[PDB]
Amino acid sequence: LLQDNMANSYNGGDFEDGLLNLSKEVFPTDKYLYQDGQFLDKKTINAYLNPKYTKREIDKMSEKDKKDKKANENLGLNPSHEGETNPEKIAEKSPAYLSNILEQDFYGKNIKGMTIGLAMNSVYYYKKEKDGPTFSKKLDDSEVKKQGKQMASEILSRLRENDDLKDIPIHFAIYKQSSEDSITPGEFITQATAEKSQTKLEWHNINEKSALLPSSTAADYDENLNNNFKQFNDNLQQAVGKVKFVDKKPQRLVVDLPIDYYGQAETIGITQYVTEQANKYFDKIDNYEIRIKDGNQPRALISKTKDDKEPQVHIYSN
């Protein structure tokens, strides 16, 4: 259910791992206990994802819908439809900018910190009729960012009304999804930390690009990495990678390497060779993992973090 309230599963998965990655900076694991978010329950999140309603829109809403939607609190962060009901006109004037909200909680149970991620649309999808094709409207990049920041500010005000949450630092980050058809996921675009007791949000751009390897995108951002990956593949006589460029510098390389249904001895031999090649071609990347798998299951994992002298190798049991 990564695809729930997201453009696709890729974005859903990438958004969460990316939020976690920021949390690992702000609330390091050596200092904080990590938990799934508990303070915004799913009914509350669903209400925040609604459009803001006009008086007349609430007037004609059923008691049941008013209840499910928390209508008398009118918590929707998305643009009001302002009485408009034509799907295309809504797409033109009041498309949904906010797709999902993800919360992470941190402890030393006295909460000590929180991270809030906002997943935004780069593209708004709609149908003009029940069984009709999908239509789309491109959203403006700067408007997406402006919207995210304003929404994060309103979320922070709502959180600070909770007596348990008066004081903790709360980190916000804004993720812009790619299109539903993109295999490449979106990227974080900005973040801000409300430090102790702060009820307002000063933002820091994030210059991040998700890329496949090999690709034109990778060649564009870091030609040497792209050439090295191609050479890694050529040496393998196949492998497909993904990477983030942050300020043009590659990080968080993930490589998938499909193999045939080999025995365990061959699996070790494959890992011996691939480890050698990763040393040769990926050494400038702080964090990487290579997932070796056959058509049934993971067979081996080679991984490297910044404080690894050498890459670490795990062979999965039968």
Side-chain angles (χ1 to χ4, degrees):
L1 69 175
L2 291 176
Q3 53 290 323
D4 281 350
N5 292 124
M6 298 297 283
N8 59 26
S9 61
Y10 300 123
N11 278 277
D14 188 61
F15 166 53
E16 177 172 36
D17 286 338
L19 194 64
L20 198 67
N21 172 247
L22 296 174
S23 291
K24 291 194 285 173
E25 296 171 348
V26 181
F27 303 107
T29 58
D30 64 2
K31 288 185 79 127
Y32 293 87
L33 151 68
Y34 274 40
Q35 283 195 13
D36 280 349
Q38 301 298 335
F39 285 83
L40 296 176
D41 57 25
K42 52 181 53 302
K43 187 174 179 199
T44 297
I45 290 166
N46 213 17
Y48 282 21
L49 296 174
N50 285 337
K52 200 170 173 173
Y53 297 123
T54 65
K55 183 257 182 315
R56 267 145 185 165
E57 276 159 358
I58 301 162
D59 288 346
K60 69 200 74 196
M61 192 176 297
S62 68
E63 293 310 312
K64 190 181 165 278
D65 285 356
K66 282 183 201 168
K67 238 87 135 207
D68 296 349
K69 288 181 170 173
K70 303 181 173 291
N72 305 123
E73 297 175 66
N74 204 9
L75 298 162
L77 297 172
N78 271 315
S80 185
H81 299 331
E82 297 295 350
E84 183 60 68
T85 60
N86 185 307
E88 215 204 299
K89 295 175 174 295
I90 289 171
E92 291 168 357
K93 299 179 278 176
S94 51
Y97 280 90
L98 178 69
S99 191
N100 200 19
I101 298 174
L102 177 59
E103 178 195 335
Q104 303 170 335
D105 295 348
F106 308 101
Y107 296 81
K109 284 257 157 35
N110 292 300
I111 191 155
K112 300 304 187 174
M114 184 180 296
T115 291
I116 302 291
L118 295 79
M120 313 301 290
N121 296 321
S122 60
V123 183
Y124 171 75
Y125 298 101
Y126 70 101
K127 299 174 180 182
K128 306 185 190 185
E129 57 157 40
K130 186 191 183 304
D131 307 310
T134 299
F135 292 78
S136 77
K137 290 286 165 293
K138 188 71 183 61
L139 306 179
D140 180 84
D141 287 340
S142 296
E143 190 65 30
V144 169
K145 188 189 277 176
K146 180 184 180 180
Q147 289 299 320
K149 290 182 184 179
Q150 292 176 345
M151 290 164 182
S153 290
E154 174 67 25
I155 294 171
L156 171 65
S157 302
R158 294 169 185 186
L159 296 162
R160 291 296 195 205
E161 296 181 337
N162 189 313
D163 292 277
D164 293 327
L165 306 180
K166 300 288 178 191
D167 297 329
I168 57 153
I170 311 176
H171 188 63
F172 295 79
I174 310 302
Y175 183 85
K176 184 167 53 94
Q177 298 185 87
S178 58
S179 61
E180 65 177 27
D181 71 328
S182 181
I183 291 186
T184 298
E187 41 270 319
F188 282 91
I189 60 176
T190 189
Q191 64 189 329
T193 308
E195 296 294 349
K196 48 182 255 196
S197 305
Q198 294 176 340
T199 67
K200 308 302 186 198
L201 299 164
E202 179 171 0
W203 288 86
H204 303 280
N205 289 323
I206 296 172
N207 305 125
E208 168 172 288
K209 186 71 191 79
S210 300
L212 296 179
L213 280 158
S215 65
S216 296
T217 304
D220 186 10
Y221 285 73
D222 187 341
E223 175 177 304
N224 290 318
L225 178 58
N226 196 62
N227 287 340
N228 276 349
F229 198 92
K230 290 195 281 169
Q231 190 61 243
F232 169 76
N233 257 330
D234 282 358
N235 287 358
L236 295 189
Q237 298 79 20
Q238 187 59 78
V240 171
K242 62 202 181 196
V243 70
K244 317 276 182 198
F245 298 100
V246 178
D247 292 304
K248 312 308 218 312
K249 175 168 182 281
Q251 53 173 259
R252 301 175 267 148
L253 169 66
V254 173
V255 185
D256 290 311
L257 199 164
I259 58 166
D260 203 7
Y261 305 108
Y262 286 115
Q264 295 281 64
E266 195 83 9
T267 298
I268 292 191
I270 296 164
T271 309
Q272 284 170 304
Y273 182 77
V274 167
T275 301
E276 168 199 305
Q277 301 302 314
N279 284 331
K280 192 172 334 181
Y281 299 109
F282 305 145
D283 61 307
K284 293 285 174 161
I285 294 156
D286 289 2
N287 194 297
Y288 70 73
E289 69 195 42
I290 309 168
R291 292 96 145 261
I292 300 174
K293 62 180 140 304
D294 62 23
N296 297 329
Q297 79 191 31
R299 299 302 301 279
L301 176 70
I302 303 169
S303 62
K304 174 89 170 177
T305 67
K306 201 198 169 84
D307 37 54
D308 279 332
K309 305 187 80 188
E310 295 275 281
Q312 304 291 120
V313 182
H314 175 74
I315 310 298
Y316 290 95
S317 59
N318 278 321

PDB file of all heavy atoms in Angstrom, residues 43-54:
ATOM      1  N   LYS A  43      -7.479   9.228  10.101  1.00  0.00           N
ATOM      2  CA  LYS A  43      -8.677  10.024   9.853  1.00  0.00           C
ATOM      3  C   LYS A  43      -8.323  11.512   9.810  1.00  0.00           C
ATOM      4  O   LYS A  43      -8.892  12.279   9.024  1.00  0.00           O
ATOM      5  CB  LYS A  43      -9.730   9.766  10.942  1.00  0.00           C
ATOM      6  CG  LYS A  43     -11.070  10.443  10.656  1.00  0.00           C
ATOM      7  CD  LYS A  43     -12.129  10.054  11.683  1.00  0.00           C
ATOM      8  CE  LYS A  43     -13.447  10.760  11.405  1.00  0.00           C
ATOM      9  NZ  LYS A  43     -14.282  10.739  12.643  1.00  0.00           N
ATOM     10  N   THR A  44      -7.407  11.930  10.676  1.00  0.00           N
ATOM     11  CA  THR A  44      -6.986  13.329  10.690  1.00  0.00           C
ATOM     12  C   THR A  44      -6.184  13.652   9.423  1.00  0.00           C
ATOM     13  O   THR A  44      -6.437  14.675   8.779  1.00  0.00           O
ATOM     14  CB  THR A  44      -6.204  13.679  11.962  1.00  0.00           C
ATOM     15  OG1 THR A  44      -7.062  13.504  13.099  1.00  0.00           O
ATOM     16  CG2 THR A  44      -5.745  15.114  11.938  1.00  0.00           C
ATOM     17  N   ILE A  45      -5.226  12.799   9.075  1.00  0.00           N
ATOM     18  CA  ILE A  45      -4.495  12.975   7.805  1.00  0.00           C
ATOM     19  C   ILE A  45      -5.457  13.057   6.611  1.00  0.00           C
ATOM     20  O   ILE A  45      -5.345  13.959   5.770  1.00  0.00           O
ATOM     21  CB  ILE A  45      -3.397  11.911   7.576  1.00  0.00           C
ATOM     22  CG1 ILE A  45      -2.234  12.128   8.559  1.00  0.00           C
ATOM     23  CG2 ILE A  45      -2.907  11.941   6.104  1.00  0.00           C
ATOM     24  CD1 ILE A  45      -1.264  10.955   8.661  1.00  0.00           C
ATOM     25  N   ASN A  46      -6.401  12.122   6.535  1.00  0.00           N
ATOM     26  CA  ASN A  46      -7.385  12.148   5.447  1.00  0.00           C
ATOM     27  C   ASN A  46      -8.162  13.467   5.376  1.00  0.00           C
ATOM     28  O   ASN A  46      -8.435  13.975   4.287  1.00  0.00           O
ATOM     29  CB  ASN A  46      -8.351  10.965   5.568  1.00  0.00           C
ATOM     30  CG  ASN A  46      -8.814  10.448   4.209  1.00  0.00           C
ATOM     31  OD1 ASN A  46      -8.200  10.741   3.173  1.00  0.00           O
ATOM     32  ND2 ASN A  46      -9.892   9.670   4.203  1.00  0.00           N
ATOM     33  N   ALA A  47      -8.493  14.030   6.531  1.00  0.00           N
ATOM     34  CA  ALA A  47      -9.163  15.327   6.581  1.00  0.00           C
ATOM     35  C   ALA A  47      -8.251  16.451   6.071  1.00  0.00           C
ATOM     36  O   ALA A  47      -8.709  17.360   5.391  1.00  0.00           O
ATOM     37  CB  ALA A  47      -9.646  15.620   7.987  1.00  0.00           C
ATOM     38  N   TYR A  48      -6.955  16.378   6.384  1.00  0.00           N
ATOM     39  CA  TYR A  48      -6.011  17.428   5.955  1.00  0.00           C
ATOM     40  C   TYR A  48      -5.879  17.377   4.426  1.00  0.00           C
ATOM     41  O   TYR A  48      -5.617  18.386   3.775  1.00  0.00           O
ATOM     42  CB  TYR A  48      -4.627  17.200   6.586  1.00  0.00           C
ATOM     43  CG  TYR A  48      -4.434  17.598   8.056  1.00  0.00           C
ATOM     44  CD1 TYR A  48      -5.509  17.744   8.948  1.00  0.00           C
ATOM     45  CD2 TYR A  48      -3.144  17.747   8.570  1.00  0.00           C
ATOM     46  CE1 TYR A  48      -5.290  18.079  10.322  1.00  0.00           C
ATOM     47  CE2 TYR A  48      -2.919  18.051   9.915  1.00  0.00           C
ATOM     48  CZ  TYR A  48      -3.985  18.226  10.781  1.00  0.00           C
ATOM     49  OH  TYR A  48      -3.712  18.529  12.099  1.00  0.00           O
ATOM     50  N   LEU A  49      -6.066  16.189   3.854  1.00  0.00           N
ATOM     51  CA  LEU A  49      -5.907  15.974   2.392  1.00  0.00           C
ATOM     52  C   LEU A  49      -7.087  16.453   1.549  1.00  0.00           C
ATOM     53  O   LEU A  49      -6.972  16.597   0.304  1.00  0.00           O
ATOM     54  CB  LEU A  49      -5.639  14.503   2.095  1.00  0.00           C
ATOM     55  CG  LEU A  49      -4.339  13.902   2.648  1.00  0.00           C
ATOM     56  CD1 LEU A  49      -4.368  12.433   2.357  1.00  0.00           C
ATOM     57  CD2 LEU A  49      -3.087  14.633   2.039  1.00  0.00           C
ATOM     58  N   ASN A  50      -8.220  16.681   2.218  1.00  0.00           N
ATOM     59  CA  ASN A  50      -9.389  17.248   1.586  1.00  0.00           C
ATOM     60  C   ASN A  50      -9.150  18.659   1.098  1.00  0.00           C
ATOM     61  O   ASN A  50      -8.255  19.349   1.608  1.00  0.00           O
ATOM     62  CB  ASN A  50     -10.557  17.304   2.582  1.00  0.00           C
ATOM     63  CG  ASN A  50     -11.177  15.954   2.832  1.00  0.00           C
ATOM     64  OD1 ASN A  50     -11.069  15.057   2.005  1.00  0.00           O
ATOM     65  ND2 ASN A  50     -11.840  15.802   3.980  1.00  0.00           N
ATOM     66  N   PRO A  51      -9.963  19.115   0.123  1.00  0.00           N
ATOM     67  CA  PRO A  51      -9.996  20.555  -0.113  1.00  0.00           C
ATOM     68  C   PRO A  51     -10.604  21.257   1.104  1.00  0.00           C
ATOM     69  O   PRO A  51     -11.345  20.629   1.868  1.00  0.00           O
ATOM     70  CB  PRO A  51     -10.925  20.703  -1.331  1.00  0.00           C
ATOM     71  CG  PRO A  51     -11.737  19.464  -1.377  1.00  0.00           C
ATOM     72  CD  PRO A  51     -10.876  18.368  -0.779  1.00  0.00           C
ATOM     73  N   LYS A  52     -10.258  22.525   1.320  1.00  0.00           N
ATOM     74  CA  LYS A  52     -10.990  23.331   2.282  1.00  0.00           C
ATOM     75  C   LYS A  52     -12.406  23.561   1.741  1.00  0.00           C
ATOM     76  O   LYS A  52     -12.584  23.785   0.542  1.00  0.00           O
ATOM     77  CB  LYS A  52     -10.297  24.667   2.536  1.00  0.00           C
ATOM     78  CG  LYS A  52     -10.762  25.271   3.833  1.00  0.00           C
ATOM     79  CD  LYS A  52      -9.930  26.458   4.252  1.00  0.00           C
ATOM     80  CE  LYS A  52     -10.549  27.118   5.482  1.00  0.00           C
ATOM     81  NZ  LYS A  52      -9.635  28.182   5.980  1.00  0.00           N
ATOM     82  N   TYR A  53     -13.408  23.475   2.617  1.00  0.00           N
ATOM     83  CA  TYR A  53     -14.805  23.566   2.180  1.00  0.00           C
ATOM     84  C   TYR A  53     -15.390  24.952   2.425  1.00  0.00           C
ATOM     85  O   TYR A  53     -15.046  25.611   3.411  1.00  0.00           O
ATOM     86  CB  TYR A  53     -15.659  22.494   2.875  1.00  0.00           C
ATOM     87  CG  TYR A  53     -15.252  21.081   2.528  1.00  0.00           C
ATOM     88  CD1 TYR A  53     -14.891  20.169   3.517  1.00  0.00           C
ATOM     89  CD2 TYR A  53     -15.228  20.650   1.197  1.00  0.00           C
ATOM     90  CE1 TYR A  53     -14.514  18.880   3.191  1.00  0.00           C
ATOM     91  CE2 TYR A  53     -14.853  19.360   0.869  1.00  0.00           C
ATOM     92  CZ  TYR A  53     -14.489  18.483   1.868  1.00  0.00           C
ATOM     93  OH  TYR A  53     -14.117  17.192   1.525  1.00  0.00           O
ATOM     94  N   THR A  54     -16.262  25.392   1.515  1.00  0.00           N
ATOM     95  CA  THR A  54     -17.032  26.612   1.723  1.00  0.00           C
ATOM     96  C   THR A  54     -18.207  26.319   2.655  1.00  0.00           C
ATOM     97  O   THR A  54     -18.530  25.152   2.918  1.00  0.00           O
ATOM     98  CB  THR A  54     -17.591  27.140   0.399  1.00  0.00           C
ATOM     99  OG1 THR A  54     -18.541  26.204  -0.119  1.00  0.00           O
ATOM    100  CG2 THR A  54     -16.462  27.369  -0.626  1.00  0.00           C
TER     101      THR A  54
END
